[PDB]
Amino acid sequence: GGSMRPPIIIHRAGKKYGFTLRAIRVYMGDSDVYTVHHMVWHVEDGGPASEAGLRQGDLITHVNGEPVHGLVHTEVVELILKSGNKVAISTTPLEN
Amino acid sequence: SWESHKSGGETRL
């Protein structure tokens, strides 16, 4: 795949980061093993995350320098809100 | 793969 995911610094323009953090615990099958991941379901191409560089349909690996891997639906959101009026969303670029 | 789409709602930023 790729190494060193590039964090996209969004900036809350007095409203929101303009993107949906879809939570999805990817199970490996019938077993209890699963990874708690998240993906931007929809990013508002009107100012925030989109203009920042966040391309819709990307998988978030880290947030503000904190692995999202294992964070619950609201934990990622909080991690972002916690950052302040902005946040470094680490997404996974394309790969062969 | 894919499960928590409803588990937690549809909270966004």
UniProtKB/TrEMBL annotation, chain B:
It is found in: Virion membrane. Belongs to the lyssavirus glycoprotein family. This is Glycoprotein. The gene is gp.
